Structures are given as C-alpha cells and as structure tokens.
Amino acid sequence: QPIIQFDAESWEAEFTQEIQDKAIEGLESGSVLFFPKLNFPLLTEELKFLDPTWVSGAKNISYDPRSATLKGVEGKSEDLRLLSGLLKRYAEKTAAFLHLLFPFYGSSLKIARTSFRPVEISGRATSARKDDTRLHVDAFPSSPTGGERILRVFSNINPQGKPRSWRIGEPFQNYLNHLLPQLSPPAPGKRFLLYLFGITKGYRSLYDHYMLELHDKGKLDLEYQKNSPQVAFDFPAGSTWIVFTDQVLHAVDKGQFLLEQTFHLKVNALKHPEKSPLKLLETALNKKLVSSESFKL
Ligand SMILES: [Cl-]
Numbered sequence: 001q002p003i004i005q006f007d008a009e010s011w012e013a014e015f016t017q018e019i020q021d022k023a024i025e026g027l028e029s030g031s032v033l034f035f036p037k038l039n040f041p042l043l044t045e046e047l048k049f050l051d052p053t054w055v056s057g058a059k060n061i062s063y064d065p066r067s068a069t070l071k072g073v074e075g076k077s078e079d080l081r082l083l084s085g086l087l088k089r090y091a092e093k094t095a096a097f098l099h100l101l102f103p104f105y106g107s108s109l110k111i112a113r114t115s116f117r118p119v120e121i122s123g124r125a126t127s128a129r130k131d132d133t134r135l136h137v138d139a140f141p142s143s144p145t146g147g148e149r150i151l152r153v154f155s156n157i158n159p160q161g162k163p164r165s166w167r168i169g170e171p172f173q174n175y176l177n178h179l180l181p182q183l184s185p186p187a188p189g190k191r192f193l194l195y196l197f198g199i200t201k202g203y204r205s206l207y208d209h210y211m212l213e214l215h216d217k218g219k220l221d222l223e224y225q226k227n228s229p230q231v232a233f234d235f236p237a238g239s240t241w242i243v244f245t246d247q248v249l250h251a252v253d254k255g256q257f258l259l260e261q262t263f264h265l266k267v268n269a270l271k272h273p274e275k276s277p278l279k280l281l282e283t284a285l286n287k288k289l290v291s292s293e294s295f296k297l
C-alpha cells in the first residue's frame with residue numbers, strides 16, 4: 001500500500017488512536033501518508049512569493065526554525081520578514097500536526113529545515129546524482145544524518161490547481177538488495193578528510209556513506225530506473241503528505257510551489273526500529289554503521 005489516504009483537513013484537530021496506529025504503522029512500513037484535503041493557506045500578503053524569481057542562488061529558499069534564519073533569497077527587509085513568516089508558520093503547523101498524529105514519538109521529533117520550492121520541476125536539468133526525476137532515497141553528501149531518520153511533510157500550494165507529480169518506488173529492502181552488488185566501502189581516511197575540510201557538516205558515518213551510494217548508484221542504474229516497480233501519483237493542489245524520504249523511493253516529475261518541512265528522528269524512537277534503513281543496512285552488512293551508536297544490552 002504505497003499511499004495511505006487520510007481524511008483530516010485541519011492542522012489542529014486531534015486524531016483517534018485507530019488513525020494514529022494506521023499512520024505510524026504505514027509511515028514505518030514505507031508508505032506515503034496522504035491528506036488530500038489538508039490545505040496550507042497563504043496570507044494575501046504572501047501570494048506575491050508564488051514566483052520563482054525569489055530564488056537567488058539555489059533552487060530552494062530555506063528557513064531554520066531553531067535559529068529563525070532565512071537563506072537562499074535576497075530582498076528588502078519587509079519582504080524577507082514576510083517570507084520568514086510564511087516558512088515559520090509552516091514549521092509551526094507541521095510540527096503541531098506531527099505531535100497530534102504521532103504521540104508515540106513524543107519529544108523525539110526534532111525539527112530541521114523548512115524549504116519553499118517555487119521553481120517548476122519539469123523545466124529542470126542537472127547531474128544525474130541531483131536529478132530528482134530519478135528514483136532515490138534522500139541522502140545529502142554535505143549533511144550526514146548519523147543514522148537519524150529524515151521525515152518530511154510536504155504541501156502543494158500551487159495557486160493554479162496544478163498537481164505535483166511523484167513516482168513512488170519499491171520497498172527499501174528490495175532497493176538495497178538490488179543495488180548491493182554495486183556497493184563499496186569508502187576509501188580509507190577519506191571521510192575524515194571531508195570532515196576536516198568542512199565538506200561535510202559533521203562526520204559521514206558508514207551508514208551515510210552507504211545511503212549515498214544507494215542514492216547515487218541507484219540513479220545511475222538506468223535499467224532499474226526504467227523497469228523497477230513504481231507507481232505514478234499526482235498530489236493535488238491543496239493537499240499534504242508525510243514520508244520517511246530516506247526509506248520511501250521517490251521521484252518528482254512535474255509541479256510548482258511546494259512547502260516542505262524536515263524533521264529528524266532517532267532510530268531508537270521508532271515503533272519498529274528493525275524496519276529502518278539503518279538497521280536494514282546493518283543487518284545486510286553485518287556491522288555497526290554509526291560510531292557513536294548508543295550501546296545497549
Ligand atoms: Cl483517516
């Protein structure tokens with residue numbers, strides 16, 4: 001069940017336990033949780049930001065709710081204030097929503113960066129590794145996770161009713177298996193140099209190395225990209241969806257105007273830690289893949 005549909009239409013309403021169970025079981029099983037009627041409205045003063053020209057240097061404007069810092073956009077103070085207010089509101093509403101929906105995670109949900117993506121996808125072209133029209137799990141070379149989960153909330157806020165077209169691939173375990181023969185260890189000492197040189201924020205654990213390998217090699221495997229099991233789904237304007245994007249194989253084909261909020265979650269906070277990419281990889285390679293892993297007995 002690659003996509004599980006939910007009826008909630010409000011960012012603040014509570015959920016029954018039955019729905020909460022459906023959500024956490026589906027999320028940890030690698031399904032997309034889809035809320036077709038959960039729209040994120042914009043203020044009239046914010047409608048002018050539905051314009052790709054606000055991006056100045058990147059493809060995404062980003063906000064850190066922890067430090068209240070806005071990046072990727074230039075402009076006058078009042079416009080940066082309004083744009084910060086938009087992404088701050090998305091951070092607050094998605095954070096509240098996740099705490100209503102996933103009480104099992106308690107305070108282990110750690111907010112990370114917000115993004116606003118106003119560039120139309122179909123006009124994109126880049127290196128194969130960054131080509132997000134290729135199925136992948138998320139792994140960022142500059143930002144290792146140390147095994148923590150990448151949990152994202154997405155909202156399509158296109159004002160012309162245009163959907164956001166995704167493809168959703170096969171289960172992580174199948175992906176990992178398919179690509180395993182292609183995986184290779186890192187060159188001795190290399191990850192330490194990337195850390196020493198500031199190329200990576202923190203140290204790239206073995207887990208992060210292998211997720212990058214999956215990410216990259218998977219994107220370069222053209223036969224896999226063409227022939228592997230995958231479903232195409234259009235997320236309508238005014239909808240929201242929630243995904244462990246380090247686990248759900250995904251790709252975007254077209255669309256414009258997306259709000260996205262990233263959260264991090266430690267593996268030990270999961271209901272079924274054994275379903276995590278970390279544990280699956282540690283089982284497949286029979287080794288500990290993150291060095292400061294808490295030790296248990
Ligand atoms: Cl529901």
Ligand SMILES: [Co+2]
Nearest residue numbers: 137138245250
């Ligand atoms: Co992605």
